[PDB]
């Protein structure tokens, strides 16, 4: 277990420094996304909550092809205004629901420490 905690105020810090065998080891879902919502890192526990298998989602569009529940002002439409903002730092509840039990989670999206990166920090409710 790596200890850091869902939603800590430094958590980009933090993980800046993990490769993807440490992201494995964390407590919490974590994805990271580039700007445009491709997945480029994608951690087990988030396989646990969700069924799908880390290493074969990298690549894919996270909005487009493998969470399309998500792709709606709620979730994407916050996402697509914080990468043109340059900032992102929001925490909200949602229902992960395609082919998929419904499971209701809460999710934190933030801005990466490198460039053009943004993680979606995930957690059951
Ligand atoms: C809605 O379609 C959500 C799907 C989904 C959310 C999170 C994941 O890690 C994988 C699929
Ligand atoms: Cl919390
Ligand atoms: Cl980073
Ligand atoms: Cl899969």
Known sequence: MEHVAFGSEDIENTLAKMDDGQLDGLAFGAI??????????YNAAEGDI?????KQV??????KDVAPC???????????????????????????????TPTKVKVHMKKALSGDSYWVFVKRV
């Open 58 to 63: 990298i690549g894919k569009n996270f909005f």
């Open 50 to 54: 969700t069924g799908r298998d880390p």
């Open 70 to 100: 998500t792709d709606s002002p709620e979730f994407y439409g916050k996402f697509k205004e914080g990468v043109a903002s340059g900032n992102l730092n929001t925490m909200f509840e949602y229902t992960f629901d395609y082919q998929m």
């Open 32 to 41: 990271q996304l580039d700007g445009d919502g491709n997945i480029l890192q």
